[PDB]
């Protein structure tokens, strides 16, 4: 099927582009119901939790805002009291009550502070010439609760520190750490910091056994008693940051509540609207057209017409660059030009590539017809992931049912690439059985490929090239091909479909558009096509064409300009090539 411009258009119409947007701020965790409900359960139960999702989602900011609105009983006074001259314990009194027990002490009613005083009893008995309590923290309301985010999870920052007054130390030189500041509230840490700082094991001991030991230096130290920890801990990281941790059975025992962010949201008016109020709350001066373009770029970032990228921080960053190009104002134009300027800043590699193609240094065809050749499409695996055409050839000779991937044999192709070649072999052997095993040897090459290549998305290009070489069928060179194939010859979805289409358009444009150029791709990728304006306009102009197919043979038909049947069709030509190859091989 031909995809009309109307079928391809995906962008949101803009009405009144320059009108200022006025919208209220959405709540924390909008569109992230799963994670919000997980966290509510952790708050309700007192459970420790972990927040998981890809980078730049705004997980930390959403979490601090959600915690900001909570309420808890005012946290107790928190202090170190000596039980000895080499021993200390961590103690809570009801809030404020510290300053009174301190002044009573500062002399020379507190049922909780028993052991401190008992043990505070023989300077008189021996003239025996370091003793007053050490307030770590206090506060006036548990609303908001204590919220301590410590991004740098070293032992001293987690657990506090012993200072040394020349060498001596005592109860009053013990400084608190994040764990101490987070009591009666929330401690937030990054999974990655716990790993990198080597503090995961000591952090477990703190939570499993109440062992919280201030950091010392390798003279003579104070013993610090364990203490019942009163805090909720929330770890933050990516799916991958957590896999180190999840191989420790203790991780699951301690961190029961998974709060997982989706990398995308539904592309809905409600989510557009929420995006708008969020941007306004961040301080942007936003116009309707500016909101619309940012929303649609989020859909394009997701490569899904019906979903949008949920990475609020990436959206904000693009908006910040747009705001500069609009002189402080976030407009449709400013966003389109921020996007263009990102591509320009990263375009050197493609400009070198296109120049090499124009010069004939890389040999590519974008017009005419040839047997056993086709433009497939690849993506370069360095950000921002440009797509390019790659010339592929297939050559057929009389022989013993061999399909040879030259790139794979030379060590350039990977396991999935290899798998796609094997799959085609399975299709071809079983599809053409009249001569027993296939009387051809077929060799496939990515002609100017010098790098490792991986994936199954050249399967369609390979199979059509192969059928073309078997049948001596000239194929159009103005249509590039992308698609995976299964053993039955159906065409399957591929990735990076926008970059691929746009990459072939870019080469066609640099070599001069013929008016008949285009791309054959999987029907299964229709919902991923969120093509840039320039390709859409070319397709609207009849200057570029997109075909969607379900089977390999459908692709061959388009490329060879005939049907498989209605014989004089392709199938009889294919069968005739195979008979010719079998006569050369046998007789």
């Amino acid at each position: 099927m031909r995809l009309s411009y109307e079928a391809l258009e995906w962008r949101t119409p803009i009405e009144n582009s320059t009108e200022p947007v006025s919208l209220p701020p959405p709540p924390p965790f909008f569109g992230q119901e799963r994670a919000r409900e997980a966290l509510e359960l952790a708050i309700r139960g007192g459970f420790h939790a972990y927040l998981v999702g890809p980078p730049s989602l705004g997980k930390h900011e959403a979490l601090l805002a959600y915690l900001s609105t909570q309420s808890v009983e005012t946290p107790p006074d928190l202090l170190y009291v000596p039980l000895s001259e080499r021993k200390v314990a961590v103690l809570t009194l009801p809030s404020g009550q510290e300053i009174h027990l301190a002044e009573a002490v500062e002399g020379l009613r507190f049922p909780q502070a028993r052991a401190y005083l008992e043990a505070l009893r023989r300077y008189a008995e021996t003239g025996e010439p370091q003793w007053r309590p050490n307030l770590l923290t206090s506060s006036s309301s548990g609303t908001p609760p204590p919220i301590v985010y410590e991004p740098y999870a070293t032992a001293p920052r987690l657990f506090g520190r012993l200072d040394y007054l020349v060498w001596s130390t005592n109860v009053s030189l013990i400084r608190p750490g994040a764990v101490h500041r987070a009591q009666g509230g929330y401690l937030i840490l990054d999974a990655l910091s716990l790993k990198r700082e080597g503090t995961w094991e000591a952090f477990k001991r703190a939570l499993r056994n109440g062992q919280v030991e201030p950091v010392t230096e390798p003279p003579a130290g104070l013993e610090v008693e364990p203490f019942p920890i009163q805090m909720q801990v929330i770890l933050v990281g990516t799916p991958e940051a957590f896999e180190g941790l999840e191989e420790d059975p203790a991780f699951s025992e301690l961190f029961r509540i998974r709060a997982e962010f989706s990398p995308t949201l539904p592309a809905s008016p409600e989510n557009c609207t929420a995006l708008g109020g969020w941007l306004l709350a961040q301080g942007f001066q936003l116009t309707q057209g500016g909101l619309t373009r940012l929303y649609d770029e989020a859909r394009r970032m997701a490569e899904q017409r019906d979903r949008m990228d949920a990475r609020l921080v990436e959206i904000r960053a693009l908006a910040e660059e747009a705001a500069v190009l609009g002189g402080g104002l976030l407009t449709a134009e400013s966003v389109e030009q921020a996007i263009a300027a990102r591509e320009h800043r990263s375009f050197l590699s493609e400009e070198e590539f296109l120049r090499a193609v124009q010069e004939g240094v890389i040999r590519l065809r974008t017009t005419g017809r040839a047997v056993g050749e086709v433009n497939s499409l690849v993506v370069v695996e360095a950000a921002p992931y440009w797509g390019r055409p790659a010339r592929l050839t297939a050559r057929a000779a009389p022989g013993r049912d061999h399909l040879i991937s030259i790139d794979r044999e030379a060590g350039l192709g990977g396991q999935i690439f290899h798998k796609a070649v094997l799959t085609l072999a399975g299709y071809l052997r079983s599809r053409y059985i009249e001569h027993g095993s296939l009387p051809v040897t077929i060799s496939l090459a990515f002609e100017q490929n010098y790098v490792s290549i991986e994936g199954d998305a050249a399967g369609l290009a390979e199979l059509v090239a192969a059928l073309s070489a078997i049948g001596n069928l000239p194929l159009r060179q103005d249509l590039a091909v992308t698609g995976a194939v299964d053993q039955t010859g159906k065409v399957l979805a591929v990735g990076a479909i926008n970059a691929k289409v746009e990459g072939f358009f870019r080469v066609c444009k640099a070599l001069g558009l013929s008016g008949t150029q285009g791309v054959i791709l999987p029907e299964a990728n229709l919902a991923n096509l969120t093509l840039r304006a320039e390709v859409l306009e070319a397709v609207r102009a009849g200057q570029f064409h997109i075909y969607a197919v379900e089977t390999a043979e459908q692709a061959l038909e388009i490329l060879a300009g005939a049907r498989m049947e209605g014989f004089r069709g392709l199938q009889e030509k294919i069968r005739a090539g195979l008979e010719a190859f079998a006569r050369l091989e046998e007789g």
Binding site: V380, A390, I453, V494
Partner: peptide, 5 residues
């Protein structure tokens, strides 16, 4: 850089 199809 390596390439994906």
């Amino acid at each position: 850089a390596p390439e994906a199809v």
